[PDB]
Amino acid sequence: IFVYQNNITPSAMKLVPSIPPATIETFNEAALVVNITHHELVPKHIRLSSDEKRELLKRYRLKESQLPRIQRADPVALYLGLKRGEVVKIIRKSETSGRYASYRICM
Amino acid sequence: MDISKPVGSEITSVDFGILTAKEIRNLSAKQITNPTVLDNLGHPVSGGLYDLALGAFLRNLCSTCGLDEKFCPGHQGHIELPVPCYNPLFFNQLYIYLRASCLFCHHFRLKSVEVHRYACKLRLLQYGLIDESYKLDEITLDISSTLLNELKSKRSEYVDMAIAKALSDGRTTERGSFTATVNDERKKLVHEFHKKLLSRGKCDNCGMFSPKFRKDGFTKIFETALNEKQITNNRVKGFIRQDMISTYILSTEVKNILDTVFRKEQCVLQYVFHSRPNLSRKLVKADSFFMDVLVVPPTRFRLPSKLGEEVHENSQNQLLSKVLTTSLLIRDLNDDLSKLKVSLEDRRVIFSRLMNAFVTIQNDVNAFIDSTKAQGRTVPIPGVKQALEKKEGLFRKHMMGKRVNYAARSVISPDPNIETNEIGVPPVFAVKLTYPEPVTAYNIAELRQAVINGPDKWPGATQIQNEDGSLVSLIGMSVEQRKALANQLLTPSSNVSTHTLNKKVYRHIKNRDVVLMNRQPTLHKASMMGHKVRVLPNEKTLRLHYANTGAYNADFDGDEMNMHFPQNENARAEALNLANTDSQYLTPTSGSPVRGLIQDHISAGVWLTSKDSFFTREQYQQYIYGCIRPEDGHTTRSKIVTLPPTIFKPYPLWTGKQIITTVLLNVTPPDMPGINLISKNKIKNEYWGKGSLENEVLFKDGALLCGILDKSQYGASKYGIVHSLHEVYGPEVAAKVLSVLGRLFTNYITATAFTCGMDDLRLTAEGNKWRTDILKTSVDTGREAAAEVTNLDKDTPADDPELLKRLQEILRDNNKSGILDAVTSSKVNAITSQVVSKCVPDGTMKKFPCNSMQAMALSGAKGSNVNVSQIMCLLGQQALEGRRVPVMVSGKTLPSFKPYETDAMAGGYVKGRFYSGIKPQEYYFHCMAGREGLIDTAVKTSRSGYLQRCLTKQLEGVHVSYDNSIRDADGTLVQFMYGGDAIDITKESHMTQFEFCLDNYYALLKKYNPSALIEHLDVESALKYSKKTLKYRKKHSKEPHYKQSVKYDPVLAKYNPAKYLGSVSENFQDKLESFLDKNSKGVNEKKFRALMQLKYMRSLINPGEAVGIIASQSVGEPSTQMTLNTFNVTLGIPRLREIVMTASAAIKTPQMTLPIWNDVSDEQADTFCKSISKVLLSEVIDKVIVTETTGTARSYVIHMRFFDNNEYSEEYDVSKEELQNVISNQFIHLLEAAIVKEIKKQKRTTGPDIGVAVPRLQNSKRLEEDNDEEQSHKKTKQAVSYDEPDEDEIETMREAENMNKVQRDRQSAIISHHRFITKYNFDDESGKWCEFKLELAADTEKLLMVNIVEEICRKSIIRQIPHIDRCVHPEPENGKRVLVTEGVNFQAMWDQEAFIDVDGITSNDVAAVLKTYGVEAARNTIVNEINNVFSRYAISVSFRHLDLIADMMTRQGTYLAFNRQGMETSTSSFMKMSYETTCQFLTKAVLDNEREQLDSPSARIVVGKLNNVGTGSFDVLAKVPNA
Amino acid sequence: YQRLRHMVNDKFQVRSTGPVNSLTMQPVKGRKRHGGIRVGEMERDALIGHGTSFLLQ
Ligand SMILES: [Zn+2]
Ligand SMILES: [Zn+2]
């Protein structure tokens, strides 16, 4: 994790996905002033294990892409540090059912 | 459709491709070469458009299949084009590949390694693997060929391995996986590829430049010559070629360039043109973009149109003949070209002859395909593209919608004597509408009579179909032949080829048949229900019961309705069990009733169920049989049971309420116990006298023991008697009760009538005295309010000169007049309320129940207490557009009133009533307010037509799957569970009505029979888990949502609600447990819990239910009720359009709701509001004095007289220091730039041009038509689709994607920073003024400085927080202390943590919320914002609908709108083609080589396949005994 | 009382099996010509709504 102050050089930004399997994540300290997952409208997002995903795709007989999507650059996706393929479990409070478990695939 | 004719073969999928020239030449029936269509005499010319080889024409037999005009299907022919032509639909694409390719090495100018990178990514995307396509970009080692070829090898190695690995598992098939997200990733790449392809100038493979290609509107390409820099580049790179061994360009040259390029770049184009893997292994050839031949459609689809006597030539034949003339001409030009040549040199002519030949045939080809691509001829003939998109298009006008057989139309007339589930069919329709009834042993008797009766005697038969397939019409036949055919109906089939079959009788529509009743617009599925046919003799109109009035939204004001007669038993069963009226008691919008009695019946019930209503044995029994007939199957006991009398001695008498008890006792099942309900009435106990309980509706064991029955009981009102009966006994019983009550009250209104008269409008002498006395105080009110707003002590006289001057100030200002109007209105309306409260009802001469005018308003039969008060007391203050009566420039509201009159009457306050009459002044004012409403109905462009049409086309496929999840047409998951609990809205009503369910325990326990279910379900698994989740939930009650335990997720997520008793929503669980704790009451608290658990189980949404259409209908239909204008933020349909239709990132009224802490006071919050609110220089300035003096130089002395320092510091939170910085840095720099610009503008244009013309300053009968004229046309028109967007929507769719030392140093520093100022003195001690001198040149002359300064002051900002204009403090919303911002900037509010709770900061802007807080937060904003639109208009829409809509908008992880843009990411090309731009979506489908899987409702309709929703969500198989 | 000149049941029609257009082979437009009643996109939407696939068919 690299917390930058104002801006990063376009040449320096190219060095971010240059060393796999190691991942580099950049964050502006002004954008980290308030935690987004603490907001009342942001439910509890939980990244699922390769086994938990495997089980979910079996119960509903789903294909990776056939699921609701979460962008790789989505604020919460960037917070948990989601990679393409990773499934996230969303426990959201409904004004009809209460606690409801939904899911999203990061592409 | 014939059931005797089954089909064994079916179309499973449609493949889009291009016809090859070689393919057309072989299938062609005849080559068309002749432009003439007919020979002399009248026979079709050989080689012409009417050739008999193309099919039978002019009573001649076809020369291909030999059949006549009837049986011949027609045959395709072909035109041989003498030169190849660009196919208009694919010209744009071939153009892209022409500009992207090198003219030397004949490769794309983009580097091969980069091209291979796209080919790799596109191959991996043929299979459903996006993650791998991105992982390819990670594969990395002016660069050597040996190194780059290794990169291509390593990339190809990963592609081959990733495909094989995913192929080994169930990740992708040999045919490849294809999803909308996969399609999104493909569409992105194919776009990026063409963008990179077009960008390259110099070829990356061989460094030589290619000449750029330009294009015009029509299909024609030119070649622009290279520049000297690029020509010298060709020379220096000319030697390396040897070692290896504007002008128009012809169609052949382009084809030849693309021929080599498509061969050399075949690898990438293989995946660029194939959506899924190319299993056919076909070569991607350039000649697919070119047309060497034209297919000639069969004569069958090119027949000449006959209108009366005149036989008009077919427009397609005309366009085809033109192609034929040009082809013969080029054949001659090529023949003359073939002759001669030794003599040449001037070859500029032979190319000029060639260019003309090519451009002429091309134009003729274009004119035939797409007319809007052909040259203007001195309206043109429509092309085949125009034929598919004439108006709404072939797909919308003739596929998605069609004119139908076995259907009728007529004006509807009311009828209370028919059942609520029936339709009164005129005998005219009954003798024409027939059903194909197959003759059998069980119905031979019934059909023999019908056959004898014939086509004019009902119940008869129009025709008889034999087992051989032939038809025998009974129309011309006499009783003798009909009698003979009837005795031949059940004869055994001699033919073994038809022994399986039996004869059919096309019998008249009987009283046992189903019909589909339709009243347009069909805004919701309740506007298309199934009715039971009741043929009524001597009728000329369709008769309909009053209970149906609501659902159809049909008023008997001369309305028209469509009757559809389905022709098979599967369609019958559906119209009787799914779309039938009785199953439509509750609307899915809110789960509330849309069925009930409307006017006479409500007034009849209040009288019949009244204590005063008594009946003798003779009277009582008559009322029972009058509405309940056992012969019509109204009874459940086969004998009319009767209660004993309520009065035994002296005379035997029955009460009115006892009739209601007896009706229920005979219509409800005997096996089930009576209904138990404690409801309320619209009529208060006070009206029925002292100590009455007649408001409390009491039903104990199916007996009305207390209270009368209103609109609140047997009307379309929730939790009434009919609804309570509907929940306990079902929909069939509730329907019987409605029809029974409907008859009873009709019969009761016949024996005991109901009237309204003058006696019901009169006040007593006592009551009228009160009226005059309260209205006597209203004279003072006018001047009192006028003296209050004007601010004058001791209440000055009405003729006061200072007051009259003060009222004038008010007259000239729109805001000041508003304050005066609102104050005077509130005061006179208080006098109105007093009159009404006193006089009604305690002052009315005739009183309830006898006062029918009063009775109708209280019962809810018709009218309200407001209408009653206007009739008997006063009309009140006539309000016009929120204010009072309009006033003239003279200060007079009418020529009768005094200028600036301080009287209530002058302002529009009407003391008069409609009973006594209204004065002429009051009459004119009432005319104003009366018309005002009708004017608003004329100026209302907002329509719900297009809004609903956009939702329905994108949600049609969305339904409930057998795995309880909400899945789209293509199997893609939208929701994991409907509303997170899987409950049907039409069931979720008494599910929380625990007291009701308890009072009816044994009745519901018998309803939800568990004895036949206990062996099929689990009784503990879910119940145990429910306790474990409740345990962890109670542990983290005070804890916040982010810190909450994630150990155990909800019981519904782990256990199937239809299989496990207890897998209930936590909302239901909490509500049920709370009831058992707060209410301790032979039913145990444990056995009741099981019943409610079982009720939830039986309230689940059925798999197959089209929740998509239902949702859009549930948002569309009630959004028609919000077409009216405002009485700041965007409301109604425009706000709903901002969300659903456009998903705007630029909202009209962006806001932020800031929750303030408890430690921050009301004064502190208001100071904070001032601190963020945008402050302008204009807001602090009182006066500006400019003293223009010309001496030596134009000297401008600008003095800024501000308000007092303490005044603006307490009103804007702005200091004197803050004012100094803005003037010294912003204002002077802005003023200097404005003066310089004004000097330039003066010297630029000296004056306007004289003599030269300047621009001007600024359906007819349809706009001149009144409502009765305009509605008379809509009355008969059978709608193609939903309303139309021709309003504001069309303009929204018009957007594409002596001084101190310190003061002297300050002045001197400012002089160095400004080019025109000389002096600068500012009030530093007091802070009241700012003076500065401006020096201009002698050439600058005259200038309007005051106007220049003024404009810059209101443009100068003192303090502004980015994107925020004003922060206000409204009244606490539902107890929550909040601040509403007129702008959006979260990061700025994040810094105000001491005042605002950063974890509760709400915002209406969805896109802004998505950008900062994520997709789930934006999703929650969509469901809340759409709810705000409906809640404001007091419309309740179930959150299950909104959640589905929001989930569909957020399906891609973004914010997609219901429009062409959002739709782009959808599998079905047929669904896309039937939405808009049919030929455009078709072109995209062909180029992708797409396979339409026929899984969307639209696609299935196109190919005639049964829809996969509801009854089509499964298959029916027959169990056969023999092996 | 006043009798208004309009006769509202002027658009009264019934069709079992009448004439059809050559191209679409669908009931032709025209009350007096024994024409068909149009089942438009909204009625299609309503028939999808009930989940009544055979009524749509
Ligand atoms: Zn033929
Ligand atoms: Zn090249």
Side-chain angles (χ1 to χ4, degrees), chain B residues 920-1023:
Chain B
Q921 298 93 325
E922 303 179 321
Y923 189 105
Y924 202 86
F925 292 158
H926 184 31
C927 275
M928 284 179 179
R931 198 198 282 193
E932 229 276 307
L934 305 156
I935 297 158
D936 291 10
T937 312
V939 191
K940 51 127 191 179
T941 46
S942 59
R943 289 190 286 272
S944 179
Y946 198 66
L947 191 129
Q948 208 186 120
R949 199 193 149 261
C950 292
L951 280 149
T952 50
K953 208 59 172 53
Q954 199 95 75
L955 295 163
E956 44 168 52
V958 164
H959 67 289
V960 193
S961 181
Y962 280 100
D963 67 357
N964 292 310
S965 69
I966 304 305
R967 312 288 275 253
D968 195 7
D970 59 352
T972 68
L973 198 137
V974 187
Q975 301 190 306
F976 281 94
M977 195 167 271
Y978 194 44
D981 46 20
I983 301 155
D984 199 333
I985 306 113
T986 59
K987 267 96 153 281
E988 189 211 21
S989 67
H990 292 74
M991 217 183 64
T992 50
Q993 242 69 16
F994 302 118
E995 271 182 292
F996 179 85
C997 294
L998 179 59
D999 301 340
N1000 292 295
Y1001 174 83
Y1002 300 94
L1004 290 161
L1005 195 81
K1006 206 150 185 174
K1007 179 200 168 88
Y1008 309 117
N1009 176 63
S1011 183
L1013 177 61
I1014 52 106
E1015 71 293 313
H1016 267 99
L1017 45 59
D1018 192 303
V1019 198
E1020 202 49 55
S1021 298
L1023 273 179

Side-chain angles (χ1 to χ4, degrees), chain B residues 300 396-398 400-409 411 432 518 522 525 528 540 562 564 571 574 584 956 1106 1109 1275-1276 1278-1282 1504 1507 1509-1511, chain C residues 8-18 22-29 36-57:
Chain B
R300 179 71 187 79
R396 275 176 74 187
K397 213 202 168 178
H398 293 282
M400 302 296 104
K402 281 162 174 144
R403 277 182 198 277
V404 294
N405 279 308
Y406 302 99
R409 193 168 164 95
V411 164
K432 300 283 148 283
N518 177 38
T522 320
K525 66 167 193 260
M528 190 158 210
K540 285 180 86 179
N562 308 289
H564 294 93
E574 275 190 355
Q584 307 286 310
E956 44 168 52
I1109 288 289
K1275 173 195 151 285
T1276 173
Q1278 31 224 70
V1280 186
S1281 193
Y1282 290 93
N1507 190 42
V1509 140
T1511 55
Chain C
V8 312
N9 212 214
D10 36 28
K11 319 297 165 189
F12 164 92
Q13 64 194 97
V14 54
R15 179 206 164 102
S16 54
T17 177
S22 64
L23 301 157
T24 63
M25 218 63 164
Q26 285 158 36
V28 70
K29 185 186 196 165
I37 292 306
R38 184 154 195 277
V39 175
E41 284 187 288
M42 303 193 286
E43 294 73 59
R44 176 216 88 131
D45 288 341
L47 291 171
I48 300 173
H50 296 284
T52 201
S53 286
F54 287 94
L55 278 178
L56 188 78
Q57 194 89 338

Side-chain angles (χ1 to χ4, degrees), chain B residues 56-111:
Chain B
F57 190 69
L58 293 159
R59 245 165 271 98
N60 300 287
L61 298 174
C62 170
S63 298
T64 303
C65 74
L67 292 153
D68 59 282
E69 278 94 337
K70 186 180 170 178
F71 297 92
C72 180
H75 310 280
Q76 298 185 298
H78 85 297
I79 285 164
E80 283 277 0
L81 298 161
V83 284
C85 308
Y86 311 110
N87 188 304
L89 305 126
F90 313 107
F91 183 80
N92 304 77
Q93 272 272 271
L94 79 98
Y95 183 55
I96 289 157
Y97 298 107
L98 188 72
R99 298 137 77 195
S101 56
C102 177
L103 268 90
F104 299 95
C105 67
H106 280 265
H107 276 263
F108 295 131
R109 291 194 307 275
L110 183 69
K111 210 170 185 74

